[PDB]
Amino acid sequence: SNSHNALKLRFPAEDEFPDLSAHNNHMAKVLTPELYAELRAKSTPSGFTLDDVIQTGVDNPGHPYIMTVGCVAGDEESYEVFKDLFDPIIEDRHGGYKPSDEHKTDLNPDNLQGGDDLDPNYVLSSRVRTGRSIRGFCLPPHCSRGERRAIEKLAVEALSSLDGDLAGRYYALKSMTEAEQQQLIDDHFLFDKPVSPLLLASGMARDWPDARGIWHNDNKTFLVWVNEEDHLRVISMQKGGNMKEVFTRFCTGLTQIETLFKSKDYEFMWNPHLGYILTCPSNLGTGLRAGVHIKLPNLGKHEKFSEVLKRLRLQKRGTGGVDTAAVGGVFDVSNADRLGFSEVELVQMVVDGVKLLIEMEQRLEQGQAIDDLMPAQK
């Protein structure tokens, strides 16, 4: 069953209790001596234990300013069996999302209003990314080589049946040539073995690169990663500001994949409370990041920039390409929320927020203050 956890249970809980004195992550914030003694004996059907769940958080103290999650789920059951650890973490990480709250999924592009015309003079590209887990298999931190291979087989079979706009090709990391990895690097489609101690400490990098691969359609507007951080990572993208089109392709792609999985009696891990289940609690609900690479040289240096994004429930990341080298300010702006908002709602906020960012940019271009454009917190 768990000979090892049985040996640990022979020690008093406080002898096995981690020293989190110099830590700063959500796990350490919630893991009291009491909670550890209560859950340490528990195990999930696949044998995943509390010690397995929090190991990364113990190894990685986290940092100042922002905390890290410090824990992972090894399977779908982990969230139920260790809900007393995950729930407060989730409540804290997702702005007060309660154990009793419900998550609503909305993958109907028609519910999105506008967003098909983000000013191409500012929006260089649009993208929507999410993650999915296949029910019946352990998550990356825990999946065996056999499970991982079974998942890849399922993913590849389904993906190979996509045609038309989604006709594509699979590229296994194991057999990848220097030439194809160079092309994938140039198209920003490649992923390598994680270097983050956060991911490494969880066990998700075992047997690399076995059963890991990259798939993408011929037009390079739809990309799928298999067995990296989660079973599947699905990305839709393209040049320009047609977020609606990107989202539609995103939704239709996910839908066709799921139908194909359904054909084989397989389905994505999902429930009314946590939405789509993924390895890290920070990616629950929709696990969706919808963003744009937008030119904002003026606003980008403005003192209220960060403040404007926070109020629009958006977040930014800087870029390191020739684009920003010229403009002197190209940013990657996406939605900050993940759980408690539907996919349509998250994408809508990017659409809405982007329009205001552009209006503020043009306002600044004409050398005028944007004071009366400052929005109220959303």
Add this chain to the structure above:
Amino acid sequence: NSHNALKLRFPAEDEFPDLSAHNNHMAKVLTPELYAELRAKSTPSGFTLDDVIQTGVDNPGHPYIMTVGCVAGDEESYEVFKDLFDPIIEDRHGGYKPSDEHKTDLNPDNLQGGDDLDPNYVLSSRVRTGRSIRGFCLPPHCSRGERRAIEKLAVEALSSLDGDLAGRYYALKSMTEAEQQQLIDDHFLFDKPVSPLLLASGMARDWPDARGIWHNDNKTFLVWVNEEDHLRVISMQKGGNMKEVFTRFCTGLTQIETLFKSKDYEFMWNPHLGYILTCPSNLGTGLRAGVHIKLPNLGKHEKFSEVLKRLRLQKRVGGVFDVSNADRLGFSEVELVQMVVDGVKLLIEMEQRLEQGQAIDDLMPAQK
């Protein structure tokens, strides 16, 4: 590295540089045998010994002031080529042995006094240092992509700074006319190096791409991005409150590091060399705390040179001098600023004594 492969087809003596009439630390240490042993090596980034000493071969230097004559291309340069750097470091940094260990101390609390040096003599005071981000090659070798990546990290980290800090970034490239003008008025604008020492090391490539300057609204904390080093942090202020200038120096610096770490990034550093920087002369603390003071009487005394060396200080407009600590490695940041505070007090004391037409010989400091 296959260019080095070709060079290795010639015997070492045929590739060995002609360093006659060269007055730099590299030239005073590199022997034909040391070259023959190290010329086939390379750091993971591919930096070679030839790359390390190129600036020292190109720049004979000056008969008087001596230069280091070499640069590090990445963090591993100081290790893979330690047999060349160690002797140079011992030579450049007052005997600092390979066995010695550097001790960093950025706690402004350990700074005894320095809160108010006589304003009648000290026009202004400032402290500055350099920093390298682990994982990226140094300015002599960094690719355009690395430089841009470094710039991305620095800007968002500096964006997160706030309080008496919190400022605006200014990319040299896309800098607007009004902006460039405004910066010159604040005396913050820096441009492409004219120094043949930097040019020869390959540090000005792609200028001004990925280069910029960030400073606070208050104009007391400044940071140069991707110039002589990944980062050049400066703290300044008119007056003689070196203590306050150093405090702001330490905090703003602790925060930057804070933000960097919060993304799995850290400054290059190790117990032996302190902070890793491009030029060996900047190792350890790479710190320079200086003040502009009026020492007219001393300025023309025959013991002014000896007095500075005694106090371990350096000088570089009525008696207006630029005095700063001379040491960089083997002394903590707190120790370096303390010597400047102590020595300055002693300099002003001697200046006054001279004004009264008195001795001062009894004030000759004991070689610190």
